[PDB]
Design a protein around this ligand. Structure first.
Ligand code: MG
Ligand code: MG
Ligand code: MG
Ligand code: MG
Lengths: 175, 190, 138, 199
RNA sequence: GGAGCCUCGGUUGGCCUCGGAUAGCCGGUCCCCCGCGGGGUCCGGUGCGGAGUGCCCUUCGUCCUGGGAAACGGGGCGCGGCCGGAGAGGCGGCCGCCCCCUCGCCCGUCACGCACGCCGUUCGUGGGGAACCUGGCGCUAAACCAUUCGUAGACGACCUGCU
RNA sequence: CGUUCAUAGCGACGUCGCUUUUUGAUCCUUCGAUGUCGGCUCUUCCUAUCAUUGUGAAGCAGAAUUCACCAAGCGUUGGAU
RNA sequence: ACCGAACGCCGGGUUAAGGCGCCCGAUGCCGACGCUCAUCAGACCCCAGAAAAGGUGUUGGUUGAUAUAGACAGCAGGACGGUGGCCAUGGAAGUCGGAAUCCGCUAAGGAGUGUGUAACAACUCACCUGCCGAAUCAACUAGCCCUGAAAAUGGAUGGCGCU
RNA sequence: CCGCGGCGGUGCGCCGCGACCGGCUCCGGGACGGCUGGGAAGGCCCGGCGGGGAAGGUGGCUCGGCCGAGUGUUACAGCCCC
């Protein structure tokens, strides 16, 4: 895999039926992926690690997007992981604070890139769970649990640095 | 990570007056003024209260090393206040096994000659950091007193005369000679 | 020595982005560098918007930290923010900067003529004031 | 037609970049008060980095060698010339448009002198980072004329104070004169605020 | 003042505070200190900067006459005095006297090859350099060679002497 | 081991390195020829520091001394075979 | 000799691989999220350079703990008796070593962490209080940074430079 | 010779235009299908039914002029949220 911004996909699939299994059991997976074509690949990869079930043995029954039913809320996601190291694999549990499960998943991947130089193919998302204000462990997130939350905007470095490339005025960063 | 706000108070007492021009605390009171510029520390020195009763030092969005100044500024401001109110008096005894360490201030508390250390012909003339003044003690025998308002300037000037008296090429476990700083104090307690 | 603060219910002018030139009252801060924002009256949807873009005003209307659009709308219309904004120097000097930009090449000429004259009537008056200040000094 | 940039508070190689490209487009550029220019990263760091550059020299005949200028003007001009094609004619032609100065002398002391914000320390460094002043760096590396440049520049700033003061006085007269006059200029000034000035 | 090769770029100006950035800018001081200014406090204003380079200045057809608003401003490479400027000054400013004009803003009122749809127009410009015709006031050589010297010298170079 | 005490100074059993002032491997370059060893003279460079500067260490009391740092500024000699 | 792509002579368009401070065509995006400061920073297949082992530098994880039954650090108080306990005498009454390794008083102290003794003594190191007053500590792990890291003409992320 | 009538090919040199076709490269408009017969939202509100942050509340303390601001506790709804 790679990225861009992920979505959620509900893939479901079954080992396709034989004489010896006339109505095989469907399976479902929260895939997070930049598009349905890869979602489905990703689905298989996971299924096969779990069940004896390869793409050629099976079919994907229903792959489709899953939209955030609470977009305009802001939520704290816990999110459990299983990345790889330059050494051996680890598990983690990180927390993000976002408007959409996708958003938080993407916002995870990026972080893992930064904090651990973990590429996507290295990473497995095992669950993403919206959470209460409480239950949140990470004080990164918990500093945004406040009702009278206030902060200034301090050394507010200018952009538009080349609009006026040259000029009279030295700028001003206090706002 | 970044921390949305840390901050701290300093109770300035009624004896003192403090101002602040921007980020440059100025402290005056009994013994005189003591300024200190904190351009280099990136904080919001809110002086607040009627009767101007406390200084308060914000720090928004600090990462670990940024936050750690917050206190240190505050601490430097107490010590400013302290010197204005009380003063600093760094006592330093002379310690020698044989050659007594003959000290003699000169200009006022500025110069400090230090003859017959280890029997050395060389006399260690030691100026002070200006604002400080050494003197010799009465009552206690082998003993200086470095009075001054600015802690930094005092302590530095102490060290100077601590360091002047070192031994070269010998075993300092054995050769325990010199002036060393016995006690850090004030000019008047209250 | 700060004055404008990212609060719940602080009004923000949006410097740039899609909704530039529009006001918007922060509902709620999601993140270190991203706020969940609203502009009920101003024609801006409940949406996340980063701080990067939203330079922020002296106004702060008062509703609860996670409002439901109706209620921040009510807050807005009560305080008459949209009037108050428009009588601010800021929003006036936006309009000013809009109106110079709109200027037709005919208007441009008109203006040019006007200022040509309007500067002359000052420059003489300045001359006089200088001449009179020299007489006082003598 | 001429760019005069106050070198002060820029980042050495940042401003150089802009200047280079300008100079190659045929803009006659003058930088000025270079010794104000400040290089990112802490001092000791950069002094060491200049001291490498002084270590460089042709063994057999140093006299031929990389010509380590010590003057902070030259030092800037060297780093522009590193961002030009200076062996060619067009690169040398460009470099003859750049004019640099140790402090700021008579033709440009009385000129509105620009700033490039993209080169500006207060914009490009984080405020928790160290940086050399070039002035210092030159100084310790062999530049003579620091004090002389400084002490001429005090005399420049004193003279400028006076100019500014007198400007302020004329501005105050204008403001007063408009208030004296307003009623006889009303039906101009009005039109300048219907077409977007004055407000 | 007249022609006449050549070299080219250009095709309104901006005549200046210092600087700060977890801050600034301007006022006015009722009040206090210093040398009309400087410093201070206090208060009043601005501050996504309008006392803004997102800016400011300047106008871009010519003339006529015959009203208004604005009005003593402009000129004659007009002419004499007093200044400031040394970082590579190279530029201003302010004061006397002579003559001439009615310029900016609105309008009336006509006319100016209107060259008949069509390109390098429009300026800095009396530009930089070279050769040629006019007036006024000034000027009146050193260098090299040869000769000499020996503080010098392979040769040149150098150091000296000669109504 | 070091009276004692693993680490002042050492360091087995093991292990990881750097270096090209050793020698090997190798055979790319040169056999229409790159003068084949030393010494002499002269310059310069390196540091992996013997000495000298300034320093930390000791089983440094002084004296002598090892161990380590900054350090290549300046030295590093005359002779018998 | 890699990666892209394989050639008649050209106009327009588009691409690959690689790029886009400037050298140098293109980021002069108000590009997004982190991490990171190096007195030897780093900076892109083949490739032209480093390891084991360390680091309260910082940033993440993992697992345990602690704890208003009153902590954690910081200072203050005690650290005993059965007991020269057994083996070892060369002396080990806790203390060159080794098998042991329990009870009493307990608030609580190990048949004892060290320091020191020929051997003791003496000193030192739990459990609890007072001031104190809410959170605090350990072991792992992995990202960037650092230590580990020495060569000879002056020198090479291609250069300038870049935080 | 004047007709530059009709046709055919041409222009001395420099240029400009126009409409048509080929190819590109962009721009501005509108109309539709599908989906969890899209998700959220908006707007009118009514009836209930609980749960939580934390409130026109109260309370200890602090800071300003009974009122305003800042912390703290139990927590109904006379701020909202679910
Ligand atoms: Mg032993
Ligand atoms: Mg040869
Ligand atoms: Mg070394
Ligand atoms: Mg010794």
């Amino acid at each position: 895999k790679a990225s861009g911004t992920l979505r959620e996909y509900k893939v479901v699939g079954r080992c396709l039926p034989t004489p010896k299994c006339r109505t095989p059991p469907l399976y479902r997976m929260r895939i997070f992926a930049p598009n349905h074509v890869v979602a489905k690949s990703r689905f298989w990869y996971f299924v096969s690690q779990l069940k004896k079930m390869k793409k050629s043995s099976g079919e994907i029954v229903y792959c489709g997007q899953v939209f955030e039913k609470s977009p305009l809320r802001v939520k704290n996601f816990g999110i459990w992981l299983r990345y790889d190291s330059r050494s051996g694999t680890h598990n983690m549990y990180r927390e993000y604070r976002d408007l959409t499960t996708a958003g938080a998943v993407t916002q995870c991947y990026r972080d893992m890139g930064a904090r651990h130089r973990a590429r996507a193919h290295s990473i497995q998302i095992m669950k993403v769970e919206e959470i209460a204000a409480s239950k949140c462990r990470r004080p990164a997130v918990k500093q945004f649990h406040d009702s009278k939350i206030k902060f200034p905007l301090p050394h507010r470095v200018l952009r538009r640095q080349h609009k006026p490339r040259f000029t009279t005025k030295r700028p001003n960063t206090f706002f | 990570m970044k921390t949305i706000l840390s901050n701290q108070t300093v109770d300035i007492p009624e004896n003192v007056d403090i101002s602040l021009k921007g980020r440059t605390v100025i402290v005056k009171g009994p013994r005189g003024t003591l300024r200190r510029d904190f351009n280099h520390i990136n904080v919001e020195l809110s002086l607040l209260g009627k009767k101007k009763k406390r200084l308060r030092v914000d720090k928004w969005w600090g990462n670990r090393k940024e936050l750690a100044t917050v206190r240190t500024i505050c601490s430097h401001v107490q010590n400013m206040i302290k010197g204005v109110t009380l003063g600093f008096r760094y006592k330093m005894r002379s310690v020698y096994a044989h050659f007594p360490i003959n000290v003699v201030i000169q200009e006022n508390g500025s110069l400090v000659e230090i003859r017959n250390f280890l029997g050395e012909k060389y006399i260690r003339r030691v100026r002070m950091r200006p604002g400080v003044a050494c003197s010799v003690s009465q009552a206690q025998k082998d003993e200086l007193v470095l009075e001054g308002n600015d802690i930094e300037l005092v302590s530095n000037s102490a060290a100077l005369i601590q360091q002047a008296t070192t031994v070269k090429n010998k075993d300092i476990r054995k050769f325990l000679d010199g002036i060393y700083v016995s006690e850090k104090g004030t000019v008047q307690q209250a | 020595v700060f004055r404008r603060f990212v609060e719940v219910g602080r009004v923000a002018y949006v410097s740039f982005g899609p909704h530039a030139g529009k006001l918007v009252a922060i509902v709620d801060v999601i993140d270190q560098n991203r706020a969940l924002v609203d502009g009920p009256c101003t024609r801006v949807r409940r949406q996340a918007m980063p701080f990067k873009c939203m330079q922020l005003t002296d106004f702060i209307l008062k509703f609860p930290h996670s409002a439901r659009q109706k209620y921040v709308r009510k807050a807005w219309e009560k305080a008459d923010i949209n009037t108050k904004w428009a009588a601010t120097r800021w929003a006036k000097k936006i309009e000013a900067r809009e109106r110079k930009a709109k200027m037709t090449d005919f208007d441009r000429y008109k203006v040019m003529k006007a200022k040509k004259m309007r500067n002359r009537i000052i420059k003489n008056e300045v001359k006089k004031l200088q001449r009179a200040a020299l007489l006082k000094a003598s | 037609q001429v760019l005069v940039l106050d070198g002060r508070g820029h980042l050495l190689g940042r401003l150089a970049a802009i200047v280079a490209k300008q100079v190659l487009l045929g803009r006659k550029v003058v930088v000025v008060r270079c010794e104000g220019i400040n290089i990112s990263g802490n001092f000791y760091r950069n002094k060491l980095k200049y001291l490498a550059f002084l270590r460089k020299r042709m063994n057999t005949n140093p006299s031929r060698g990389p010509y380590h200028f010590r003057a902070p003007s030259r030092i800037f001009w060297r780093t522009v010339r590193g961002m030009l094609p200076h062996k060619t004619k067009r690169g040398q032609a460009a470099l003859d448009r750049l004019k640099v100065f140790d402090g700021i002398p008579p033709p440009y002391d009385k000129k509105k002198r620009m700033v490039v914000p993209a080169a500006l320390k207060v914009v490009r460094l984080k405020p928790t980072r160290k940086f050399a002043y070039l002035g210092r760096l030159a100084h310790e590396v062999g530049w003579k004329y620091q004090a002389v440049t400084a002490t001429l520049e005090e005399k420049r700033k004193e003279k400028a104070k006076i100019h500014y003061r007198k400007k302020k006085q004329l501005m105050r007269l204008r403001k007063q004169a408009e208030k004296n006059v307003e009623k006889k200029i009303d039906r101009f000034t009005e039109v300048l605020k219907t077409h977007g000035f004055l407000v």
